[PDB]
Ligand SMILES: NC(=O)c1ccc[n+]([C@@H]2O[C@H](COP(=O)([O-])OP(=O)(O)OC[C@H]3O[C@@H](n4cnc5c(N)ncnc54)[C@H](OP(=O)(O)O)[C@@H]3O)[C@@H](O)[C@H]2O)c1
C-alpha cells in the first residue's frame with residue numbers, strides 16, 4: 027500500500043542538485059524540475075544534478091510551472107531558489123493551487139508570520155482551500171531549532187540562550203552572498219545592507235524557537251556587521267574578487283526579548299572563508315544548569331538537504347495550511363521516502 | 368481550573384533532594400516522601416532537601432508506603448532509589464496499585480522490555496488495570512536518546528552511531544558505585560562485575576534509541592572493564608579510600624546491531640575522578656554526512672532531575688501501562704507543573 031513520494035524540484039542550483047540526487051537515494055522519484063537559469067533551462071535534471079544516466083525530466087522555466095504541475099501527479103514541491111517570502115510566493119502559489127504540498131529552504135519561510143504576515147496569511151488560506159501544506163525547513167530546523175529545544179527539555183530554568191552559526195558563503199548561490207553583502211566596500215555595505223536591516227535568518231529562527239518553547243516575542247534588535255579578511259578572496263557565486271578590507275560577508279547579531287523574561291541572543295555569520303576556516307555551530311543555555319553544545323565542523327549543505335527530505339512524510343501528514351515546523355515533532359530519520367498509494 | 372501536580376518522592380537521597388526543591392520551583396506540590404535511611408526516616412522532606420522552612424511532609428520508611436499513598440492523593444511518584452528492575456519493582460507495584468503514575472531514574476527502567484521482560488510485563492498489566500503510567504527517564508532521555516535522534520533527523524544515511532558518556536560516580540549514591548564495582552580489587556572485579564556482565568546503562572539506552580528510530584535489535588554485545596587511577600581516590604557514597612589499582616569504577620562498551628544495518632557503539636564510563644577530570648558526552652553519526660556533537664562538561668545530576676520534571680505533563684497524558692519515553696515526543700521545557708482541577 028506504499029509508493030514513492032513524487033517530487034518537483036523548483037530551483038536546480040547547488041542545493042537543488044544535491045536534493046535531486048539524494049531524494050532518489052531514499053526511494054523518492056523526481057517528476058518535474060523548474061529553473062530559470064539559462065545554463066539549466068531545457069537540460070535533463072539528472073544531468074544537471076551530476077547523475078550519469080538521464081532521468082527524462084526536462085528542466086522548465088518557471089513561467090511554465092503550471093504545465094509541469096498539471097502533468098506531474100506530484101506529492102511535494104521542494105523549493106530552493108531565494109531567501110525572502112516576496113521572491114518565494116509565486117512558486118508557493120503554484121504548488122498550493124495544484125494541491126501539492128511544498129517545503130522551501132528559503133530562510134524567511136522558516137517562520138514568516140511577523141516579517142511577511144500578509145503573504146503568509148494569503149498562502150495559508152490558499153493551501154487550506156486546496157488541502158495541502160506549505161512549510162519552511164533546512165539547516166535551521168535542527169541547528170537553530172530542535173537541537174536547542176531538545177536540550178531545553180533537560181533544563182530546569184532558562185535565563186538566556188546564546189547561539190553561534192557560521193557557514194561558508196561559497197557553498198551556496200548568489201542570493202545568499204547578496205543577502206550577506208559579500209563583495210561590498212564598507213560604505214556600500216552600511217548604505218545597502220546595514221541601513222535596510224533586513225531580517226537575518228536568525229531573526230526568523232529565533233521567532234521559531236520562541237514559538238516552540240511557548241514564549242511571546244516582545245522585541246527583536248538586530249545589527250548587521252560586515253566581515254573582513256587581510257587578503258583577497260574570490261566569490262564563486264558573484265564571479266568576482268573581494269579586496270582586503272571589503273566585506274567578505276556579514277555577522278548578524280539578533281537579540282530576541284520575550285514577555286516571559288528569557289532572551290535569545292544569536293550570532294549568524296555567512297562569509298567567504300580564509301584558508302583553514304570551517305563552519306561553526308555552538309549553543310549555550312544559561313540558567314539551571316548551564317549547558318553548552320558544539321557541532322564539530324557541521325556539513326551545513328548536506329544537513330540542510332537531509333533535513334528537508336526527512337521532513338517529507340510529516341509534511342504529507344500535516345494539516346492543510348502554511349504550517350511552520352515549530353508545530354511539528356522533530357524530523358526523524360527516514361530510510362525510504364514513500365507514502366500511501 | 369488547574370492545580371499543582373501532586374508528587375510523592377520515593378528515595379530522598381542525592382537526586383531526590385534536588386527533585387524536592389526543583390519540583391516546587393516549577394509549581395508542583397510535595398504530598399509524600401519515602402526513604403529507608405536512618406538519617407531521613409521521620410525527618411521533614413523539605414529540611415532533608417536543604418530547604419529552611421519545614422514542608423510538614425514527614426519522610427516514611429518504605430514498609431509504610433501504602434499509608435503515604437492513601438493520604439497523599441498523588442498524581443505522580445518520582446522513584447530515585449536503585450538501578451535495576453528487581454530493586455524497583457516493589458515501589459512501582461505500590462504506585463500502580465494506588466493508580467499513581469510513576470517515573471523512575473533507575474537506569475534499567477529506561478528500557479527494560481528485554482533485560483527484565485517478566486517484571487516489565489507484570490508492571491505494564493498492573494498499571495493498565497489501575498489506569499496509570501510507569502516509565503523510566505533521567506540523563507539518558509536526551510543525552511543518550513533524543514539528542515541523537517534529533518541529529519539523525521538531519522542525516523541522509525546512518526552507517527554507525529558512536530557514543531561516549533562519562534559521569535562522576537561520587538555525584539551519586541551507593542547503587543551506582545556498587546553496579547560499577549567501585550573499591551573492588553582487580554581479581555574480585557573480574558570474577559563479579561566482569562563475569563556476570565549485567566546490562567550497563569547504555570545496553571538499555573541503545574535499545575531505546577533503536578525503538579525510537581524504528582530499528583529492530585538483532586544482537587547486543589557488551590564488555591565491562593574496571594577503571595583505575597595511579598593514586599588513592601575517595602568514594603563518598605561507599606565511605607572509603609580506593610587504593611591505586613583497585614577498581615575506581617567501570618567502563619562498558621556496548622555494540623548494538625540492527626536488522627536494518629546500522630550499528631550503535633556506545634562507551635559508558637562511571638568512576639571516581641582524579642583532579643582535572645570532567646563529565647564527557649560526545650556522539651558521532653557516521654554516514655552521509657558525518658556529524659559529531661559534544662556537550663562541554665555536562666551538568667549530569669541537574670540535567671537528570673530537570674528532564675524528569677519536564678516529562679511529568681507527558682506522563683500524566685500518556686496511556687496506562689509501562690510506556691517507555693521512546694513512545695513520547697521529546698521532553699519540552701515546562702515552566703509550570705500543573706494539571707486539570
Ligand atoms: N535554509 C537553509 O538552511 C538554506 C541552506 C542553503 C541555501 N538556502 C537558500 O536557498 C536558496 C538556494 O540556495 P542555493 O545555494 O541552491 O542557490 P543557487 O545555486 O543559486 O540555486 C538556486 C537556483 O534557482 C534559480 N532560481 C532563482 N529564483 C528562481 C525562480 N523564481 N524560479 C526558478 N528558478 C529560480 C537560480 O537561477 P539564477 O542563479 O539564474 O537566479 C538557481 O539555478 C538561497 O536563497 C539560499 O540562501 C537555505
Ligand SMILES: NC(=O)c1ccc[n+]([C@@H]2O[C@H](COP(=O)([O-])OP(=O)(O)OC[C@H]3O[C@@H](n4cnc5c(N)ncnc54)[C@H](OP(=O)(O)O)[C@@H]3O)[C@@H](O)[C@H]2O)c1
Pocket residue numbers: 377378379380381382383401402403404405407428429447448449450451458472473474504505506507538539540541542543668671
Ligand atoms: N537515569 C539517570 O540519569 C540517573 C542519574 C542519577 C542517578 N541515577 C540512579 O538513581 C538512583 C538514585 O541515585 P541517587 O544519586 O539519588 O542515590 P542515593 O543518594 O543513594 O539516593 C537513594 C535514596 O533512596 C534510599 N533507598 C534506597 N532504596 C530504597 C527503597 N527501596 N525504599 C526507600 N528508600 C530507599 C537510599 O537510602 P540508603 O543510602 O540507606 O540505601 C537513599 O536515601 C541510583 O540507582 C542511581 O544509579 C540515575
